[PDB]
Design a protein around this ligand. Structure first.
Ligand SMILES: OC[C@H]1O[C@@](CO)(O[C@H]2O[C@H](CO)[C@@H](O)[C@H](O)[C@H]2O)[C@@H](O)[C@@H]1O
Ligand SMILES: OC[C@H]1O[C@@](CO)(O[C@H]2O[C@H](CO)[C@@H](O)[C@H](O)[C@H]2O)[C@@H](O)[C@@H]1O
Ligand SMILES: OC[C@H]1O[C@@](CO)(O[C@H]2O[C@H](CO)[C@@H](O)[C@H](O)[C@H]2O)[C@@H](O)[C@@H]1O
Ligand SMILES: OC[C@H]1O[C@@](CO)(O[C@H]2O[C@H](CO)[C@@H](O)[C@H](O)[C@H]2O)[C@@H](O)[C@@H]1O
Ligand SMILES: OC[C@H]1O[C@@](CO)(O[C@H]2O[C@H](CO)[C@@H](O)[C@H](O)[C@H]2O)[C@@H](O)[C@@H]1O
Ligand SMILES: OC[C@H]1O[C@@](CO)(O[C@H]2O[C@H](CO)[C@@H](O)[C@H](O)[C@H]2O)[C@@H](O)[C@@H]1O
Ligand SMILES: OC[C@H]1O[C@@](CO)(O[C@H]2O[C@H](CO)[C@@H](O)[C@H](O)[C@H]2O)[C@@H](O)[C@@H]1O
Ligand SMILES: OC[C@H]1O[C@@](CO)(O[C@H]2O[C@H](CO)[C@@H](O)[C@H](O)[C@H]2O)[C@@H](O)[C@@H]1O
Ligand SMILES: OC[C@H]1O[C@@](CO)(O[C@H]2O[C@H](CO)[C@@H](O)[C@H](O)[C@H]2O)[C@@H](O)[C@@H]1O
Ligand SMILES: OC[C@H]1O[C@@](CO)(O[C@H]2O[C@H](CO)[C@@H](O)[C@H](O)[C@H]2O)[C@@H](O)[C@@H]1O
Ligand SMILES: OC[C@H]1O[C@@](CO)(O[C@H]2O[C@H](CO)[C@@H](O)[C@H](O)[C@H]2O)[C@@H](O)[C@@H]1O
Ligand SMILES: OC[C@H]1O[C@@](CO)(O[C@H]2O[C@H](CO)[C@@H](O)[C@H](O)[C@H]2O)[C@@H](O)[C@@H]1O
Ligand SMILES: O=N[O-]
Ligand SMILES: O=N[O-]
Ligand SMILES: O=N[O-]
Ligand SMILES: O=N[O-]
Ligand SMILES: O=N[O-]
Ligand SMILES: O=N[O-]
Ligand SMILES: [Cu+2]
Ligand SMILES: [Cu+2]
Ligand SMILES: [Cu+2]
Lengths: 338, 338, 338
């Protein structure tokens, strides 16, 4: 019935994003994506703590999918027979049937194909939602990602001016609830099923043990820092499927921020810290002006520094002493000061 | 002194709203409302847990009051002699005297009449506020509702276009703090006074035991699902007097959202999830496009699924396969897949 | 190299703000500020609980600094040899080097001079950020304040109209994490270093023991209530360096609110409650219409009433019975009522 060109997209692992155009003169296409569920034990902190994760495509978050307004998105969801649980997928970008969750429930050994029309622009969460208490459990076990639906003309500033990004990163933030024994040590389990009852008890107290970007504390630091150059406009897409976050680029700003994540609304300008509502994605554009290390955090600094929620950008270029300078290096306080 | 027509309004129990006009060519009236305080034990979850509630008009939330900008709102507050505590009322919509709290303190056996002018448009919280630690205790015991002050021309989209709703629902969200015994079982008390000291201890840790819509887990599910039809524009008013919430319509969107709840500000368009600040009301307009079950949740999914914060909409109509379709039902993964 | 006039500013203790112009026809200046770190035991609640604070200039919050867009801000940071720890300063208003943190680390006995250009308008947080887990610890120990960068033409309503305030107050909100012994009593320590390990354990559970304005429960109540007059436009700057807040003026409104705190964005109008993201400052303008006591709170009323987060305004003037009146004082319920 639906007679449009089909285009297969190969997803890549976050924080990177598959190749796509910003502005396009192409008409609506059927964009084909495949997501494979993988249940697996993963390391989530720098002391080696593990937990029974559940993922789309082996990563937390799941990959970012990028399409344009008016496209049709055809998603094959695969639940391999090595998994132990039923899974599904709900797209906040889609209309009807609980975002598709009601049409995509699959047992291990099955697959399903859903098609939804991208009628609403913005960044949106997708997540597993099998039903009842399984919904939060699957989500906080890692089964969430995001989709970006761009306007066909690309981004604009809400006042008639085009905005173009040179680079795009997807930072998925995950709240985790890892059970502890009586001495406070983290517990380990041989399967998701075995972890469930203890995990639910932690979840009920609503306080995460870990808050991570890209699936583990320190994932986007050190040699996995994100790269940029002075003068580049970088789009940072941030999602949180379950709990609020307050992104902040230390030493920078959000030049243009869609904190509710929807491109039909004009962005706010010059933010210090923005706010991602749990269950949503947002996006921030920033043009780097200074080289050096930047920390991207949630500005609950306890979460950022002590629970895992810090990423680094490494920015190449020349220092601008007009914007900031050390006038006098650390020196002894003058004895003749009051 | 004030010589305007008087109009008695009969309130109805949430989630329904008393009859009112959107746009009106009537001039300012004195709109007369009565609220009766009722202290009573109520069931708040599906396992039958009870707690010592305190309510306006026997319901959590208290009823929605609807007036127009420039109206005068004359509220009779009654505290029957069967109650045990003093109560009052503070309207976030009103100006002066702590929103009226300073003028409405009444002992059991008394009543009081307050008049305030509706100078500010939007949805607003009202709540009991007797003084000091009694303020949070009364509010989280259920003594809160909302008032909507419409512009005389009804809603608009902030760009010169009228917005009209076909239906309106009021969803009051309540955080509850129910004491537990040493084994974790919920405790029961013979009066609010007896529950106070144990309840305060839970409140101090800032983590609710339950988060409910319309006063109990499952209140707006099953046979009390909210009804709509494909093509209808539905206004959902959401209040939270004490704690933030992040409403989300699963399978839908917020077409027009006033998340801060004030109609002098243009709405945001096409939201996935919005944000109600604790101590505020907000409103979202959505035109249903697909039939079926929709879950309305706070998108902390732990709260939604495990603490009680899920409502259902049942929407009648015909399915639109253009917007979403199952291309291939669950089937075995092809043996010839990689 | 930089050849502009220099102007020394003398800071004052919050909630007051040093003298400054709103609109200015002066050109860019180098505005010189000095901040001295002071570690000291402080009382933070009405029962006399103490904690090992760390402050800029002896106060929580640190003082508000006010400059205009295009000014250069030259800050001398002094760490006296009586302190025990290294400190630094990061300005969310500044660009590069982690907001200046990377250029300002000083040991006890040292001082440093940083210059940054005020390129972005709004209110912004500044805070200590020495590195790693020390970042949250220093911030929640009190080392945070705010800077306001005004447009040269002063505030506007985003629709071409000037806004001018008659008075300005800075309300810094601080989440504190005070260790308890096994009976629940607060612990005391002889130094910040000794408190660290127990404090970190409380911080990890993300629930404050106290939430205060101006450094202690009741700081801005009683005789330290903030003064205003009917008809005065008052600007309230509110900062929270680590945790979200939801300001509300009980009996009032926010006439014009920049909840994200950035003056390049038009304010929202007529808010009941607004939202300060942790890691940010915001500002609200209100013109008092009624005399009397107003409570300024975070509208988590548990925090407001039971954890310390309430300030008072005392407003002088004449009561306006048109806006609000008690039509009938408390009286016995008529025996002939149903
Ligand atoms: O023996 C405990 C010790 O070993 C580590 C080393 O990386 O990890 C093990 O124990 C953890 C807690 O049960 C598990 O999460 C992990 O799967 C296991 O390899 C340390 O994290 C831990 O303290
Ligand atoms: O607005 C984007 C997109 O959503 C649709 C429905 O799929 O329209 C919704 O939003 C419109 C603009 O606010 C409303 O006027 C309409 O009633 C509502 O369904 C699309 O038609 C529109 O392109
Ligand atoms: O957190 C309580 C308590 O547990 C211990 C081990 O008994 O450490 C655990 O918790 C720490 C904080 O989450 C982790 O850093 C560590 O991996 C974990 O074993 C104690 O060190 C701590 O006091
Ligand atoms: O890119 C940051 C990196 O560059 C160095 C020299 O290679 O210094 C530059 O950046 C400093 C601020 O971080 C400036 O103060 C300095 O003047 C400038 O040359 C390194 O020191 C720095 O890590
Ligand atoms: O006997 C405990 C058992 O009975 C239930 C049945 O609905 O409710 C009773 O006990 C609860 C806990 O004290 C009370 O809240 C309730 O008022 C009382 O009827 C169960 O909820 C409970 O587990
Ligand atoms: O704005 C709605 C309504 O509020 C009042 C006071 O009751 O005005 C406030 O807001 C005006 C518009 O922002 C301000 O200009 C005014 O100073 C402030 O009191 C009403 O006059 C107005 O209709
Ligand atoms: O929550 C701790 C612990 O308490 C038990 C009974 O001992 O259940 C209580 O708490 C549950 C979660 O809130 C409720 O579902 C139930 O109504 C209540 O009695 C245990 O089941 C649980 O481990
Ligand atoms: O209204 C939802 C309800 O309608 C049924 C048939 O009565 O199916 C319709 O809705 C489905 C999506 O939920 C579509 O896939 C289907 O094609 C459409 O006919 C029921 O299956 C469904 O519960
Ligand atoms: O003896 C405990 C009792 O004294 C008070 C009186 O103000 O304060 C003391 O004890 C507190 C808890 O250790 C300390 O924070 C404080 O420094 C010390 O003077 C009461 O607060 C306390 O209950
Ligand atoms: O916008 C305020 C201020 O920020 C600067 C950089 O210091 O510009 C940023 O924001 C501009 C307006 O959005 C962007 O166009 C620009 O690319 C970005 O660096 C200043 O130039 C501007 O005055
Ligand atoms: O909070 C638990 C428990 O501790 C006690 C003293 O044992 O009081 C402490 O905690 C109170 C609430 O934070 C404070 O008001 C008080 O200053 C502190 O000592 C008990 O009173 C309470 O049950
Ligand atoms: O300014 C408030 C203060 O004024 C008094 C009289 O001095 O009363 C005025 O304010 C009341 C509302 O708070 C009005 O009801 C009253 O009519 C008005 O005269 C005091 O009662 C009040 O505390
Ligand atoms: O559906 N999963 O447990
Ligand atoms: O400025 N960063 O916390
Ligand atoms: O005023 N009530 O406890
Ligand atoms: O999409 N609902 O969680
Ligand atoms: O740097 N301070 O611990
Ligand atoms: O209206 N104040 O809580
Ligand atoms: Cu799943
Ligand atoms: Cu009450
Ligand atoms: Cu410090």
């Amino acid at each position: 019935d639906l007679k449009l060109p089909r285009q297969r997209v190969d997803l890549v692992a976050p924080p990177f994003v598959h190749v796509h155009e910003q502005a396009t003169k192409q008409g609506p296409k059927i964009m084909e994506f495949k997501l494979v569920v993988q249940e697996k034990k993963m390391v989530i902190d720098e002391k080696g703590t593990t937990f029974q994760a559940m993922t789309f495509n082996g990563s937390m978050p799941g990959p970012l999918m990028v399409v344009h307004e008016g496209d049709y998105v055809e998603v094959t969801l695969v639940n391999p027979a090595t998994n132990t649980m039923p899974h599904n997928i709900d797209f906040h970008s889609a209309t009807g049937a609980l975002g598709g969750g009601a049409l995509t429930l699959i047992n291990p050994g099955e697959q399903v194909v859903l098609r939804w029309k991208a009628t609403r622009t913005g960044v949106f969460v997708y997540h597993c939602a099998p039903g009842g208490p399984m919904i939060p459990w699957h989500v906080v076990s890692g089964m969430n990602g995001a989709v970006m639906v761009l306007p066909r003309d690309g981004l604009n500033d809400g006042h008639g001016h085009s905005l173009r990004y040179d680079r795009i990163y997807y930072i998925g933030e995950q709240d985790l609830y890892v059970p502890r024994d009586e001495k406070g040590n983290f517990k380990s389990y041989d399967s998701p099923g075995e972890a469930y009852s203890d995990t639910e008890e932690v979840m009920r107290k609503l306080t995460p043990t870990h808050v991570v970007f890209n699936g583990k504390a320190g994932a986007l630091t050190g040699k996995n820092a994100l790269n940029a150059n002075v003068g580049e406009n970088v789009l940072i897409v941030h999602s949180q499927a379950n709990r609020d976050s307050r992104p902040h680029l230390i030493g920078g700003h959000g030049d243009y921020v869609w904190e509710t994540g929807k491109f039909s609304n004009a962005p706010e300008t010059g933010l210090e810290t923005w706010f991602i509502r749990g269950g949503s994605a947002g996006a921030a554009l920033y043009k780097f002006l200074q080289p050096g290390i930047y920390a991207y955090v949630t500005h609950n600094l306890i979460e950022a520094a002590n629970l895992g929620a810090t990423a680094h950008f490494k920015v190449e270029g020349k220092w601008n002493d007009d914007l900031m300078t050390q006038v006098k290096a650390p020196a002894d306080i003058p004895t003749g000061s009051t």
